[PDB]
Symmetry: C4
Amino acid sequence: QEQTTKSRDVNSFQIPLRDGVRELLPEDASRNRASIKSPVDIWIGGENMTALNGIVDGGRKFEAGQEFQINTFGSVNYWVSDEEIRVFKEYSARAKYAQNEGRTALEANNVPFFDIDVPPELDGVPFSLKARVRHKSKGVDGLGDYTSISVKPAFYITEGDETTDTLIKYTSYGSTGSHSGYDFDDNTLDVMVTLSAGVHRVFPVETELDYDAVQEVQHDWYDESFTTFIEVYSDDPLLTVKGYAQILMERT
Amino acid sequence: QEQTTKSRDVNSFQIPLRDGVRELLPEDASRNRASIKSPVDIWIGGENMTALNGIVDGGRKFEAGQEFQINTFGSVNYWVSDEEIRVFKEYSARAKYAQNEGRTALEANNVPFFDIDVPPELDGVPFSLKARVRHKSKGVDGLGDYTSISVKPAFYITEGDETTDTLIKYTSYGSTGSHSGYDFDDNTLDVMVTLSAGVHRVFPVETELDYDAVQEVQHDWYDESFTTFIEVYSDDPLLTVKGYAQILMERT
Amino acid sequence: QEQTTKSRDVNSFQIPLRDGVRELLPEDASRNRASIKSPVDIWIGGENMTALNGIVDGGRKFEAGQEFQINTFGSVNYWVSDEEIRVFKEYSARAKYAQNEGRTALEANNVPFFDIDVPPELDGVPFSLKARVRHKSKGVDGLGDYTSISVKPAFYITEGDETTDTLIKYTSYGSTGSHSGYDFDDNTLDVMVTLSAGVHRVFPVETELDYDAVQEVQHDWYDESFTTFIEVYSDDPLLTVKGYAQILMERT
Amino acid sequence: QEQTTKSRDVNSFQIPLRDGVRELLPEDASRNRASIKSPVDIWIGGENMTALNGIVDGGRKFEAGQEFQINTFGSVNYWVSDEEIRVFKEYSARAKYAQNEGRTALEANNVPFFDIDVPPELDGVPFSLKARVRHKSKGVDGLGDYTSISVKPAFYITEGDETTDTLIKYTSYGSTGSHSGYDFDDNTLDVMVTLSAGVHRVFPVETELDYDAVQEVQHDWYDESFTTFIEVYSDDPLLTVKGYAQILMERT
Ligand SMILES: [Ca+2]
Ligand SMILES: [Ca+2]
Ligand SMILES: [Ca+2]
Ligand SMILES: [Ca+2]
Ligand SMILES: [Cl-]
Ligand SMILES: [Cl-]
Ligand SMILES: [Cl-]
Ligand SMILES: [Cl-]
């Protein structure tokens, strides 16, 4: 129907890969070729591709890091994930008390962590990091029901990569009272963080060791606190993206 | 003879790779390009390609996992294997008595196993797993010629992958008598199994430790039974397939 | 000058890669595309490519095992090597006396070996294996100048691959006398060998331990003999080939 | 606008990759295809690509060693680096006294080194290697302010690769006096070096152990000298190149 023509122009750019079946390339009569690399496994297909319940039909996989080409001028669809936001961790275990003793010390004392891989596309770009946080003190470890516990949850994050030792403490709120830990009373820790490209390690911790906890139930650093990081997540569009596909496009 | 035209449409799908020289793509005037990846080494050629006695002539190899392209509109042939069905194992050694003690325990006690790699294309799809099973008790280990031995062969299969410990026992028949083990009297163990994508480990075992075997010849768990898995195989079309080739096709 | 046309036909074949700058593909108006894989590093260029003194000019390298494409219809040249024949080894050290004790024993006793990687293209195809062999006994280790030494050089070759133990002894001549070892008197060991595809390990050895050598100079198995494998080589066209390039060609 | 045509000619060559955003390929109506491999990560884009402060915009990355293709006839730009010259090392630590004891001995005694990877394109081609060198003796380790120290800085360079032991000593000047080490008085070590392709290891050293240094402050071999290699670099166009991109071009 349409004769092949030479491509004069190259255009290179990044596509944000998001959730569900979405268009990777639009119908574009000018386009002759696209060379594409996805940082995650990616399913590629035509208008028939669907992904009901995370099962792709009418697609085929290309691997993370695999360079491939599409030479059509028509619409092309992708699927990578059904995750609407980015959930880093969900914890049921109470978080530990921790002073800023550095990465090695926290790992040595079994403080759970997770890593954020900051893509070049997010290098030095501020983003929202949140947690759903549950404080419960009433009767916990036998603590009095009316004992006032001060809490201040934090993320301790490496300023360099996961091989460096120094941590930056990030906080957004403090709270004091007798915590009943009812699910509807959960707090939101919400900080902006700005990170260099690469992997950064994050330790969700309780920073406040309350005098009353020390006296009544012999709590000490690295012990389980009255604070639990129910969910650590981001709904920031910069983080909910599953990765950026690299595109070199050629057009007439 | 035919001018080159632009491709509007992409279509992504899987081809079941079967035995002998078969067509990979048909002659199709609309087709401009195919990007293909085979999970097994694959020999690709034109109408001249043959594979008499497993020696491919008029073909060339592409490696397992290698993405390659064909830009013709003509017929294209493949060869991967001359195996008509899938034979997992053939055993001459008597199978061991085993209780469901989990994967680690069976491996520790040298119960032979084999793995089934369930492709995404077979994720949660039921399939036939069979064995040709020979019971022979007459005079074996000095057992009486008229001693009645009860048998119940099984596959113990990991429900998770080969790194998980719990096993599911699959059976289809039990048999009792004095077994002469004549080749024409061999039984067929035939079960439907439904597995998640990934590797599952399978232990062919004898599940029944007959009282008479214990008393007469001091048989015990993990000892060699009167049961031999002559052949473990499947003639189910879902398993006889050597793999699924991934295809992205572009057409005018 | 010439409009692009669709390719109907695929043709897959192997090209023998030989020495110096040679044509990889001829000018062929029908050819639209070639997908090529070389088992050795290969330099590819146009009519200007030369390789005076093993330095390629007007070429660029593609790596061993790298699939690449050429989409021209013109002539294309390659270079891989300036070696006219295949030289496996040159030895200055006297070869050891060895009985056929198997691969492990010969390696344990420091009998030098070399490996032949038999390509699929040579699977079960007989080929010439030769050695330039020098026997020198006169005054060696203090042996009498007129002592008669019997010699019978051999290649001991694994019948399976380099991981298997059994060796096959190959011979073509025996010789007896007082050997002066003059370069112009060197012998040629020349055997036909037929090997399965894959790696085979070869031990050049002296098989004859002469009674007189035992008595006079206390020679024993695994000691240095009066035999030296000056050069082990093949000028058989099946072995002088540096490898076979895999070609899938598409034509109108 | 322009109908596709067949390519008759192949041309293979190397492009010197230099600093900032530069053209990789010019607009050339004859060009139909280029297959390219860069030995370093390379950012590729159209006329819009910029790299202000080392941040590429309007580009996408191709990895070191990754073969990729461009099928346009238009201009194509690259970026690899903002480094105008090649700086190998900058040292603040005083260099050690070293005799030519070979590679192993220098490494054993903690003499800092750096490696030069000589590309095939520079095999046996002479190039300038320089250092900004600071001698300071006045009061150093308590040395007299008018003690005359003789200096002769050198590069000791492996003649084979980094796995070989012998070193070649390269020098260009000697100097004698009482060194105040003022930044504006720094010397330039400037030698031509000719190296085979591959990695060569370089030890910047002080070769002269002055009698007065031995007597006054007990200096000995492998001790810190009065010489510091402030910067080791090359502004030779053969070395300032970040690498050579391999190009196979096809044209009508
Ligand atoms: Ca309190
Ligand atoms: Ca019984
Ligand atoms: Ca004799
Ligand atoms: Ca002096
Ligand atoms: Cl969208
Ligand atoms: Cl068929
Ligand atoms: Cl030729
Ligand atoms: Cl320039």
